Design a protein around this motif. Structure first.
Motif, PDB file in Angstrom:
ATOM      1  N   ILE A 513       0.948  -1.110  -0.057  1.00 35.42           N
ATOM      2  CA  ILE A 513      -0.059   0.168   0.001  1.00 35.42           C
ATOM      3  C   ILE A 513       0.987   1.276   0.075  1.00 35.42           C
ATOM      4  O   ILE A 513       1.989   1.219   0.828  1.00 35.42           O
ATOM      5  N   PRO A 514       0.477   2.429  -0.780  1.00 40.26           N
ATOM      6  CA  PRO A 514       1.377   3.542  -0.722  1.00 40.26           C
ATOM      7  C   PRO A 514       1.311   4.291   0.676  1.00 40.26           C
ATOM      8  O   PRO A 514       0.292   4.134   1.208  1.00 40.26           O
ATOM      9  N   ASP A 515       2.454   4.812   1.026  1.00 43.40           N
ATOM     10  CA  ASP A 515       2.715   5.817   2.135  1.00 43.40           C
ATOM     11  C   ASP A 515       2.184   7.171   1.570  1.00 43.40           C
ATOM     12  O   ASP A 515       1.937   7.489   0.510  1.00 43.40           O
ATOM     13  N   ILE A 516       2.374   7.890   2.758  1.00 40.96           N
ATOM     14  CA  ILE A 516       2.463   9.426   2.503  1.00 40.96           C
ATOM     15  C   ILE A 516       3.532  10.127   2.916  1.00 40.96           C
ATOM     16  O   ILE A 516       4.559   9.857   3.841  1.00 40.96           O
ATOM     17  N   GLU A 517       4.220  11.186   2.133  1.00 35.20           N
ATOM     18  CA  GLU A 517       5.330  11.965   2.211  1.00 35.20           C
ATOM     19  C   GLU A 517       5.037  13.302   1.937  1.00 35.20           C
ATOM     20  O   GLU A 517       4.700  13.585   0.814  1.00 35.20           O
ATOM     21  N   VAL A 518       5.251  14.326   2.572  1.00 31.28           N
ATOM     22  CA  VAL A 518       5.233  15.968   2.266  1.00 31.28           C
ATOM     23  C   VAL A 518       6.675  16.182   2.804  1.00 31.28           C
ATOM     24  O   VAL A 518       7.340  16.236   3.634  1.00 31.28           O
ATOM     25  N   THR A 519       6.884  17.298   1.608  1.00 27.56           N
ATOM     26  CA  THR A 519       8.275  18.192   1.774  1.00 27.56           C
ATOM     27  C   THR A 519       7.984  19.572   1.852  1.00 27.56           C
ATOM     28  O   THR A 519       7.312  20.137   0.905  1.00 27.56           O
ATOM     29  N   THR A 520       8.153  20.050   3.087  1.00 29.72           N
ATOM     30  CA  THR A 520       7.756  21.356   3.245  1.00 29.72           C
ATOM     31  C   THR A 520       9.152  22.087   3.690  1.00 29.72           C
ATOM     32  O   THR A 520       9.908  21.732   4.569  1.00 29.72           O
ATOM     33  N   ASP A 521       9.314  23.491   3.200  1.00 31.72           N
ATOM     34  CA  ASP A 521      10.439  23.996   3.392  1.00 31.72           C
ATOM     35  C   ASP A 521      11.899  23.385   3.173  1.00 31.72           C
ATOM     36  O   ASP A 521      12.815  23.654   3.742  1.00 31.72           O
ATOM     37  N   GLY A 522      11.939  22.547   2.189  1.00 29.72           N
ATOM     38  CA  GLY A 522      13.142  21.746   1.747  1.00 29.72           C
ATOM     39  C   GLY A 522      13.435  20.633   2.719  1.00 29.72           C
ATOM     40  O   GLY A 522      14.547  20.390   2.563  1.00 29.72           O
ATOM     41  N   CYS A 526       8.173  12.364   6.828  1.00 38.07           N
ATOM     42  CA  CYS A 526       7.471  11.469   6.315  1.00 38.07           C
ATOM     43  C   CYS A 526       6.683  10.905   7.739  1.00 38.07           C
ATOM     44  O   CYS A 526       7.143  10.777   8.737  1.00 38.07           O
ATOM     45  N   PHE A 527       5.351  10.794   7.446  1.00 39.46           N
ATOM     46  CA  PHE A 527       4.556  10.416   8.532  1.00 39.46           C
ATOM     47  C   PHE A 527       4.524   9.042   8.811  1.00 39.46           C
ATOM     48  O   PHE A 527       4.678   8.418   9.930  1.00 39.46           O
ATOM     49  N   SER A 528       4.577   8.143   7.730  1.00 41.42           N
ATOM     50  CA  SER A 528       4.396   6.471   7.716  1.00 41.42           C
ATOM     51  C   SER A 528       5.881   6.117   7.659  1.00 41.42           C
ATOM     52  O   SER A 528       6.452   5.728   6.693  1.00 41.42           O
ATOM     53  N   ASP A 529       6.579   5.942   9.067  1.00 39.77           N
ATOM     54  CA  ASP A 529       7.742   5.439   9.278  1.00 39.77           C
ATOM     55  C   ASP A 529       7.680   3.781   9.756  1.00 39.77           C
ATOM     56  O   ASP A 529       8.473   2.997   9.222  1.00 39.77           O
ATOM     57  N   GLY A 530       6.737   3.551  10.529  1.00 43.59           N
ATOM     58  CA  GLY A 530       6.691   2.038  10.936  1.00 43.59           C
ATOM     59  C   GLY A 530       5.121   1.693  11.356  1.00 43.59           C
ATOM     60  O   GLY A 530       4.857   0.589  11.863  1.00 43.59           O
ATOM     61  N   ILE A 531       4.185   2.561  10.752  1.00 43.40           N
ATOM     62  CA  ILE A 531       2.788   2.392  10.838  1.00 43.40           C
ATOM     63  C   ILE A 531       2.310   1.008  10.223  1.00 43.40           C
ATOM     64  O   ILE A 531       3.009   0.917   9.225  1.00 43.40           O
ATOM     65  N   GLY A 532       1.477   0.501  10.849  1.00 43.01           N
ATOM     66  CA  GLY A 532       0.725  -0.528  10.074  1.00 43.01           C
ATOM     67  C   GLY A 532      -0.812  -0.937  10.303  1.00 43.01           C
ATOM     68  O   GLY A 532      -1.198  -0.105  11.232  1.00 43.01           O
ATOM     69  N   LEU A 578       0.863  -4.999   4.807  1.00 44.23           N
ATOM     70  CA  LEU A 578       2.228  -4.477   4.883  1.00 44.23           C
ATOM     71  C   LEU A 578       2.284  -3.175   4.063  1.00 44.23           C
ATOM     72  O   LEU A 578       1.610  -2.987   2.959  1.00 44.23           O
ATOM     73  N   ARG A 579       3.273  -2.423   4.455  1.00 40.59           N
ATOM     74  CA  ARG A 579       3.599  -1.107   4.022  1.00 40.59           C
ATOM     75  C   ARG A 579       4.904  -1.223   3.484  1.00 40.59           C
ATOM     76  O   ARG A 579       5.590  -2.210   3.245  1.00 40.59           O
ATOM     77  N   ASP A 580       5.268  -0.218   2.827  1.00 37.32           N
ATOM     78  CA  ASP A 580       6.678  -0.190   1.966  1.00 37.32           C
ATOM     79  C   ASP A 580       7.970   0.161   2.780  1.00 37.32           C
ATOM     80  O   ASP A 580       8.876  -0.579   2.849  1.00 37.32           O
ATOM     81  N   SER A 581       7.908   1.303   3.981  1.00 37.35           N
ATOM     82  CA  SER A 581       9.070   1.786   4.622  1.00 37.35           C
ATOM     83  C   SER A 581       9.132   0.753   5.686  1.00 37.35           C
ATOM     84  O   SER A 581       9.202   1.314   6.992  1.00 37.35           O
ATOM     85  N   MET A 582       9.127  -0.518   5.747  1.00 36.72           N
ATOM     86  CA  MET A 582       9.261  -1.155   7.086  1.00 36.72           C
ATOM     87  C   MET A 582      10.362  -2.682   6.733  1.00 36.72           C
ATOM     88  O   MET A 582      10.567  -2.930   7.636  1.00 36.72           O
ATOM     89  N   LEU A 583      10.534  -2.922   5.555  1.00 34.70           N
ATOM     90  CA  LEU A 583      11.412  -3.933   5.283  1.00 34.70           C
ATOM     91  C   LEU A 583      12.986  -3.576   5.490  1.00 34.70           C
ATOM     92  O   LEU A 583      13.380  -2.907   4.509  1.00 34.70           O
ATOM     93  N   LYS A 584      13.377  -3.985   6.519  1.00 36.70           N
ATOM     94  CA  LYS A 584      14.945  -3.593   6.690  1.00 36.70           C
ATOM     95  C   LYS A 584      15.943  -4.525   5.966  1.00 36.70           C
ATOM     96  O   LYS A 584      16.765  -3.924   5.457  1.00 36.70           O
ATOM     97  N   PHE A 585      15.611  -5.829   5.875  1.00 43.44           N
ATOM     98  CA  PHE A 585      16.423  -6.761   4.973  1.00 43.44           C
ATOM     99  C   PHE A 585      15.556  -7.876   4.880  1.00 43.44           C
ATOM    100  O   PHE A 585      14.442  -8.278   5.442  1.00 43.44           O
ATOM    101  N   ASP A 586      15.970  -8.473   3.541  1.00 40.90           N
ATOM    102  CA  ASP A 586      15.160  -9.801   3.065  1.00 40.90           C
ATOM    103  C   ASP A 586      15.558 -10.957   3.990  1.00 40.90           C
ATOM    104  O   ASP A 586      16.663 -11.302   4.034  1.00 40.90           O
TER     105      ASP A 586
END
Length: 1052
Positions: A513-522, A526-532, A578-586
């Motif tokens: 599932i896609p996560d969310i990321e916002v870039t403000t002031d350069g 990222c909100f979704s770091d380890g959520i599930g 499962l989300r994207d930014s959670m797989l540390k290693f295979d």
């Protein structure tokens, strides 16, 4: 009168050391000045205004002080003012009697039960200096030119014995020093303003053993062949635990016991040459390592011949019976003559495993033995080679943390300062590379967890034909994808936390599932770091094997390399997401397990929170009043039963069932029931000691729980939902403005709640959040989980010193007395650039990183320095010093993941300590802040049946004597009033020991419950037998001469 070194106030800038020495020798007696050093602000061309001079005798120092007080010292129209110094130029005792030169020094251990002492190696012409102020004894041994310093502290020696070498009973010409720990070993390494009277222009660095046969590492007792010594007994009387008796020894030819291996005190394997079991050999070696049996007393053929053929259980019982005794057993043969499956179920029930703990010191090695502890994930699938796993930690001789100066001491060579590795560094590298060879085994290196990296511990596994270290390494996962050194080690060791087994999930039930990321002031936020997300059926299925009635809305989970907390949603598709930014290693396996679900423990106000809240406008009156009312409530907890239940139901555990908790509500007077009275007294003592050590204020309107996010997007920036359970105080009066009674057990909050983390050193961490109530959010059924908004400019976890949603607790308190007017932007969470290598890890760079973690590790001192600096200057946590301290603390915290040293500056050290610290040796200064007021306030406030009973008492006494406990309350509660020198410095090892002893006593209680169930098996008859046992243990007439304990029947 303690030291003879005197500091001169003002001297001319044009003088040299020789002129001042001549002036002093002219005014004072001839050659009465030992050392004279003038500090310089440059290398050799800019002396300072003062100087330090060390005299030979205290009478000369007194005469010089008298002359200076009368202004009789005039050197080049300058009046020399004399004052006391901090340290001597040379650590030399001011005594003509304590200096011994040209004496015979030999090392060894007692051979047999007789008064015999074998000499391993003999040294001649050594120098011995006895220092009373420093509480240490130095031994200078010249070996092949370069000299060595052997330092023995007064605490390392347990007994002093006077003996003779010539055999005459009337002439004491020897002294035996029984040493418990090992001595420190140093080495000498290779002028106009320094006279020094001698060739002392060198420095001492710590090295390994210098003996070719390693006699020092295998010897636990020293010998000092001295002269007749008519008045030497008075000098030797100052050593701790001196024996006023005459004893004789006989020299024994013990030169055969010489090992050239790195690990000296281990027994030889070629001497046995048989099929001796490994477990019994390990137990015997650990017993020899302990101060119970010497090496020669256990190396005889009779002992191994007797112990080779015998039942295993009885052999282990007699071995542990001999090991548990504190007395030194000279002849174990007589003792052992006079004396005469479950692992899998334990792991599946409570994860109980036996682990071998080894301590590696620069001098020798120490083996603790099969200490029972919790089990990790690896031993679940590798439950066959339980004895192969060994926990190895690197400590000093006193079992303390290795200091920074003992490894890679700094030196200025060339234009820049280049560190120089010591022999201990190479020794540690060689030990990590080759491994420890104990008997028919050789332990390799597998990995080390994140917690063990700070504790300087590492796991070791002995290679076997079925499975080796590489097999487990490739089974856990493929670590060649990560090109970073620290990151690879962290991801390899993260799969070692204790977790409870559950069902197995296949790889086909996965989704992205896609996560969310916002870039403000350069800035990348990222909100979704380890959520599930998790479903209700999956939550019920997981909660079945652990025994949870209420389904938590969130719980920390990890499986197959993934790590993060997952939340319960009512609109899920299947049981797993499962989300994207959670797989540390295979990983090659996807075993599921959970660590902790949720605990509604009331929160506490640590030192950091009070320190950072003393700037927004919170006065000291509220803190003083709260501390006073807390002390008043705690004081009445003893004589009042009503207050005891309220304290137990609002301090430790919101919903906890205990034997003492049930009897608190309904029981007898506090004077009666001594079993509960002593527990209450020791609990009160522990609470007051903890309050003295650190500020832990009990607040009923605050909790500590994990938080998650929901896929709604209705909450804006700064709006969250707060929900927690109802305690006794909440249930007594639920009518409040900021408290909403949504349900009978769960009450919503509408107050302004701030969120902070456990570590915090920046004023911007404080952010005021307004709680909002919505029916739509309550329809989803969230509990014990703070709902963070999905949308916004910056994520809330980033506001709290850059946190992440990995199951970490949060500080929530719905108090309406805080000041929300002041707001400060938080510090940036931008970390250091990652370090990626161009090649794969060759298993040596990881060892180098592990060893280098010991040095340049200033994580513990930065917080203390920040606290001291905040205490000292006003408007704390506002100046640039506090900001720099916070940045350094953040960098040090990030040092575990990325190899970036903190680089603590020298000028930022505190050098002063407040009253509320255990640094008695360091200078203590009076503090006038809120913490000082709290400390002053607390200081003012403080100022058939018989067989089972005998077996339980024997087990309790054995545990107490093995762990050093002397009482029942200190071994049941888990807190020891008396601790070693290393247990009081750091709390991690003490907490580990407390957890281990708690696990042991709970195992003993479970075994007692099983015995009770097996004995009767009839409910009413079991109750009758329990009543009979209570009557027997309550009657004082039935107690025998032995120490009868009354904690046996108290099982429910």
């Amino acid at each position: 009168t303690n030291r003879s070194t005197v500091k001169i106030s003002n001297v001319p800038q044009t003088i040299v050391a020789d002129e001042l020495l001549r002036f002093l020798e002219l005014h004072l007696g001839e050659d009465t000045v030992f050392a004279l050093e003038i500090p310089t602000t440059r290398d050799n061309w800019k002396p300072r205004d003062f100087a330090r001079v060390q005299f030979t005798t205290l009478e000369v120092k007194s005469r010089a002080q008298l002359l200076s007080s009368q202004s009789k010292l005039l050197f080049k129209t300058h009046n020399l003012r004399l004052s006391e110094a901090y340290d001597d130029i040379i650590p030399r005792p001011v005594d003509p009697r304590k200096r011994l030169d040209d004496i015979v020094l030999t090392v060894g251990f007692p051979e047999s039960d007789e008064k015999r002492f074998c000499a391993l190696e003999k040294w001649d012409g050594v120098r011995c200096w006895i220092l009373t102020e420093k509480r240490r004894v130095e031994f200078w041994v010249w070996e092949s030119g370069d000299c060595y310093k052997i330092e023995v502290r007064f605490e390392d020696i347990i007994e002093t014995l006077s003996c003779c070498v010539n055999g005459d009973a009337s002439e004491i010409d020897a002294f035996l020093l029984k040493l418990k720990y090992g001595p420190k070993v140093f080495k000498r390494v290779t002028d106009r303003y320094r006279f020094c009277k001698e060739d002392f222009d060198f420095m001492w660095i710590r090295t390994t053993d210098f003996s070719g046969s390693k006699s020092i590492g295998t010897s636990t007792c020293f010998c000092l062949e001295v002269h007749n010594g008519s008045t030497m007994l008075d000098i030797f009387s100052g050593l701790p635990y001196y024996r006023e008796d005459t004893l004789s020894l006989t020299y024994v030819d013990g030169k055969t016991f010489a090992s050239a291996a790195q690990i000296v005190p281990l027994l030889n394997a070629a001497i046995l040459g048989l099929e001796f079991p490994y477990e019994i050999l390990f137990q015997l070696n650990a017993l020899v390592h302990a101060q119970k049996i010497s090496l020669f007393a256990a190396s005889d053929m009779e002992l191994i011949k007797i112990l080779r053929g015998m039942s295993l259980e009885t052999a282990l019982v007699i071995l542990k019976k001999l090991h548990q005794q504190s007395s030194i057993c000279y002849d174990p043969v007589f003792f052992v003559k006079t004396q005469m499956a479950s692992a899998y179920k334990r792991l599946t029930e409570q994860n109980i495993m036996s682990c071998q703990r080894a301590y590696v010191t620069p001098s020798k090695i120490y083996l603790l033995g099969p200490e029972l502890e919790t089990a990790n994930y690896v031993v679940k699938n590798f439950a066959e080679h339980v004895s192969d796993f060994m926990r190895v930690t690197f400590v000093e001789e006193d079992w303390s943390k290795l200091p920074a100066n003992a490894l890679s001491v700094n030196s200025k060579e060339g234009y820049f300062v280049k560190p120089s590795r010591t022999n201990i560094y190479n020794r540690v590298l060689s030990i990590l590379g080759e491994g420890i060879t104990v008997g028919p085994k050789r332990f390799e290196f597998l990995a080390f967890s994140a917690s063990q990296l700070r504790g300087n511990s590492v796991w070791m596994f002995a290679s076997n034909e079925k499975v080796k270290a590489e097999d487990i390494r490739e089974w856990m996962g493929c670590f060649r994808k990560i090109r970073s050194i620290s990151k690879c080690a962290a991801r390899m060791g993260q799969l070692f936390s204790a977790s409870r087994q559950t069902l197995i999930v296949r790889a086909q039930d996965v989704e992205q599932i896609p996560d969310i990321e916002v870039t403000t002031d350069g800035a990348d936020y990222c909100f979704s770091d380890g959520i599930g997300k998790i479903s209700l059926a999956f939550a019920k299925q997981v909660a079945q094997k652990c025994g949870l009635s209420h389904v938590p809305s969130a719980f920390q989970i990890r499986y197959g390399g993934y790590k993060g907390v997952i939340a319960v949603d009512r609109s899920s598709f299947r049981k797993l997401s499962l989300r994207d930014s959670m797989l540390k290693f295979d990983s090659n396996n996807r075993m599921l397990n959970v660590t902790r679900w949720t605990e509604s423990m009331p929160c506490f106000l640590n030192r950091e929170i009070i320190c950072l809240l003393s700037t927004l406008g919170i006065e000291d009156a509220m803190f003083e009043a709260m501390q006073a009312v807390h002390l008043s409530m705690l004081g009445n907890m003893l004589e009042d039963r009503d207050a005891a239940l309220n304290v137990l139901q609002k301090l430790s555990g919101e919903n906890s069932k205990n034997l003492l908790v049930k009897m608190l509500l309904q029981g007898y007077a506090p004077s009666s029931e001594p079993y509960l009275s002593m527990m209450l007294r020791v609990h009160h003592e522990s609470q007051l000691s903890e309050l003295k050590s650190r500020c832990r204020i009990l607040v009923p309107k605050g909790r500590i729980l994990i938080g998650c996010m929901d896929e709604m997007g209705i909450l804006e920036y700064g709006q969250v939902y707060v929900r927690v359970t109802l305690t006794k105080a909440e249930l007594k009066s639920r009518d409040q403005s900021y408290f909403r009674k949504i349900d009978e057990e769960t009450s919503v909050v509408i107050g302004k709640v701030v969120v902070t983390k456990n570590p915090c050193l920046h004023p911007g961490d404080i952010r005021v959040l307004d709680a909002i109530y919505e029916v739509h959010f309550e329809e989803k059924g969230y509990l014990d989980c703070i709902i963070f908004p999905q949308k916004g400019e910056r994520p809330h976890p980033n506001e709290c010193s850059g946190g992440d949603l990995d199951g970490d607790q949060f500080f929530v308190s719905w108090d309406e007395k805080i000041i929300p007017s002041e707001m400060d932007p938080p510090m940036d969470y931008a970390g250091s650039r990652p370090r990626l290598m161009d090649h794969d890890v060759t298993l040596e760079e990881i060892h180098k990183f592990f060893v280098d973690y010991m040095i340049s590790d200033t994580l513990g001192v930065i917080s203390t320095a920040h606290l001291v600096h905040a205490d000292r200057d006003p408007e704390k946590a506002r100046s640039q010093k506090c900001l720099e301290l916070a940045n350094l603390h953040s960098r040090a915290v990030d040092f575990a993941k990325t190899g970036a040293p903190a680089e603590m500056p020298y000028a930022l050290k505190p050098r002063e300590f407040p009253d509320f610290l255990e640094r008695f040796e360091k200078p203590t200064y009076i503090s006038e802040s809120v913490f000082g007021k709290l400390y002053r306030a607390v200081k003012s406030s403080l100022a058939t049946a018989k067989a089972h009973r005998d077996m339980y008492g024997e087990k309790l006494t054995s545990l107490m004597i093995y762990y050093g406990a002397a009482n029942e309350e200190e071994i049941l509660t888990g807190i020891l009033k008396t601790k070693e020198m290393y247990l009081a410095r750091d709390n991690r090892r003490y907490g580990d020991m407390k957890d281990r002893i708690t696990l042991s006593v709970k195992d003993l209680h479970k075994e007692a419950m099983g015995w009770f169930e097996k004995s009767c098996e009839d409910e009413q008859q079991k109750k009758k037998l329990a009543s009979a046992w209570y009557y027997v243990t309550y009657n004082p007439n039935h107690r025998d001469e032995k120490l009868t304990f009354l904690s046996f029947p108290w099982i429910v």
